[PDB]
């Protein structure tokens, strides 16, 4: 019963950052050495936890959040960050305990005509709370006049698409991101290391 990190990291299709995907890890042994012994990651930033020191540790639950952004925005998947992604798409708490794993996916998420399936939220009337997921497509009212679900003057559709073409420079090519988060409650633990 090894934990299904494979069906999260090698999922053929990922998800847009505004509708980020969460996988609940439960009732399994997690061999995190497969993660940090891999030579195919660009970034492996862990916060408040040591990935090399938890294969003899147990947790009540582990969450695997996966989505796609661009290289300029990978630095925003971290506690205490601001920007389009951190404020309107995916926010991490200041006391975040987990890892942010990212790798370039230009060979997978780019098309010659430009990949326009991956979206991100451009406007929102307020910042996201940590681990909040907004999928609404309501028209953003930027001015005094109120829109009636119609797009127009000072009335924007809230989702814009990434322009992932294979010829984009580093930072505008897509990156797939997996965010592992760990919680420990006063409840039984189901995710342990092999030790």
């Amino acid at each position, epitope marked *: 019963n090894l934990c299904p990190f494979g069906e999260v990291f090698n999922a053929t299709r990922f998800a847009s950052v505004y509708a980020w995907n969460r996988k609940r890890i439960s009732n399994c042994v997690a061999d995190y*050495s497969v993660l*940090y012994n891999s030579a195919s990651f660009s970034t*492996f930033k*862990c916060y*408040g936890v040591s*990935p*090399t*020191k938890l294969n003899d540790l147990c947790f009540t639950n582990v969450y695997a959040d996966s989505f796609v952004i661009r290289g300029d925005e990978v630095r925003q998947i971290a506690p205490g960050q601001t920007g389009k992604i951190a404020d309107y798409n995916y926010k991490l708490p200041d*006391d975040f305990t987990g*890892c942010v794993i990212a790798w370039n996916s230009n060979n997978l998420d780019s098309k010659v005509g430009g990949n326009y399936n991956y979206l991100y939220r451009l406007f929102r009337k307020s910042n996201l709370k940590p681990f909040e997921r907004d999928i609404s497509t309501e028209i953003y009212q930027a001015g005094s006049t109120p829109c009636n679900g119609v797009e127009g003057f000072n009335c924007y559709f809230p989702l814009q698409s990434y322009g992932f073409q294979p010829t984009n420079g580093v930072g505008y090519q897509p990156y797939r991101v997996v965010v592992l988060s760990f919680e420990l409650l006063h409840a039984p633990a189901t995710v342990c290391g092999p030790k």
Partner: antibody, heavy 120, light 114 residues
């Protein structure tokens, strides 16, 4: 061992000269490690200078060392650097590099230190 | 910015007795997600790099004798060397790794009481 940090040799420099000391991590899983620099003046305690994540070169400094030193890294050779542009006599100390997989994690691996001497 | 103050600065304890070192933080270091305090204890000897003894306030690092134990919560933490031995004579620092900048205590010297 999960990680070992080897450090450059002892340095005898003159006041005003520049200096760059290194700290190379030897082991697998270095992608997850953050390397910090600790200064220990002769007969004094431990001062945390800064830390750097070599994967993207995110660098945080202590307010006592902000702008006084430059902590760089070369992720292609698992090496982190600590350099001065103009050495003062008050820079004579031993400099330990310390590593730990993750940030806000204990520094659980240390090098044997690099002793720097800025002196006629 | 978190500041740590150790006490006492010097400590003399007879062979086989209990040595206790206190560490006070100007701010809490408790992560709510995993109920753990982000406080560590280090030992240093002359000509040697610091050795990690205890992390998460009360968890023993590998290669540390059973007689080393940590405790505390909030802002008061304690390193306890029960049955003090000869090679335990060293300087002991408490470090917080709750947030950057990392900070150390001023150091506590522990000697055998002849």
């Amino acid at each position: 061992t999960q990680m070992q940090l080897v450090q450059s040799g002892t340095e005898v420099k003159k006041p005003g000269e520049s200096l760059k000391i290194s700290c190379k991590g030897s082991g697998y899983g270095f992608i997850t490690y953050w390397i910090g620099w600790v200064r220990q003046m002769p007969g004094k305690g431990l001062e945390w200078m800064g830390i750097i994540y070599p994967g993207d070169s995110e660098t945080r400094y202590s307010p006592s060392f902000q702008g006084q030193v430059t902590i760089s890294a070369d992720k292609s050779i698992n090496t982190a650097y600590l350099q001065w542009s103009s050495l003062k006599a008050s820079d004579t100390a031993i400099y330990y590099c310390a590593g730990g997989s993750g940030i806000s994690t204990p520094m659980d691996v240390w090098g044997q230190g690099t002793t720097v001497t800025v002196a006629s | 910015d978190i500041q740590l103050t150790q006490s006492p600065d010097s400590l003399a304890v007879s062979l086989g007795e209990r040595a206790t070192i206190n560490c006070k933080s100007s701010q809490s270091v408790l992560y709510s997600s995993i109920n753990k305090n982000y406080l560590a204890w280090y030992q240093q000897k002359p000509g040697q790099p610091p050795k990690l003894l205890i992390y998460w306030a009360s968890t023993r690092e590998s290669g540390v004798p059973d007689r080393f134990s940590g405790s505390g919560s909030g802002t008061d933490f304690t390193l306890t060397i029960s049955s003090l031995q000869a090679e335990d004579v060293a300087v002991y620092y408490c470090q917080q790794y709750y947030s950057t900048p990392y900070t150390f205590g001023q150091g506590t010297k522990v000697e055998i009481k002849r």
